[PDB]
Amino acid sequence: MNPPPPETSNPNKPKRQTNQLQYLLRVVLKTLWKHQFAWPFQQPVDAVKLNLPDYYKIIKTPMDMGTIKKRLENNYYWNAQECIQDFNTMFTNCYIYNKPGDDIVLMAEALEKLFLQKINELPT
Numbered sequence: 001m002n003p004p005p006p007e008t009s010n011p012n013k014p015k016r017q018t019n020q021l022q023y024l025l026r027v028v029l030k031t032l033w034k035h036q037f038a039w040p041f042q043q044p045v046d047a048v049k050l051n052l053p054d055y056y057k058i059i060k061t062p063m064d065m066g067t068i069k070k071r072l073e074n075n076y077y078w079n080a081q082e083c084i085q086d087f088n089t090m091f092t093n094c095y096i097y098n099k100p101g102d103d104i105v106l107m108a109e110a111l112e113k114l115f116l117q118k119i120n121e122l123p124t
């Protein structure tokens, strides 16, 4: 069974737009999105559809790139680090719920490497 997906707007949270956040959407997210291994991470895990009744019993801070994309589009974040933290939560969740060597873990490992490569240098 599925919890509500993470919020993508919050009126009492202040918004901001920065060059770095713009780059995270235009370049980082949009590029990762097209990778052959991106598909498992483009939406919240649907435990009912995927028959993973223990997923949310294990993962308490769910995150996915669809959520991140909507957050960036809504200027939800204060700064780039806040957004980078969501990517890191998404990768870490995958390593937590699964096991080394699993196909989905190999996917996350590859994406994480590409992600780090892209955020190594951000605009000023």
Ligand SMILES: NC(=O)c1ccc(N2CCOC2=O)cc1
Pocket: 040, 045, 050, 093, 094, 097, 098, 104
């Ligand atoms: N986020 C995860 O740990 C996760 C997500 C999806 C899967 N499934 C079910 C469909 O194929 C998969 O790899 C398995 C694990």
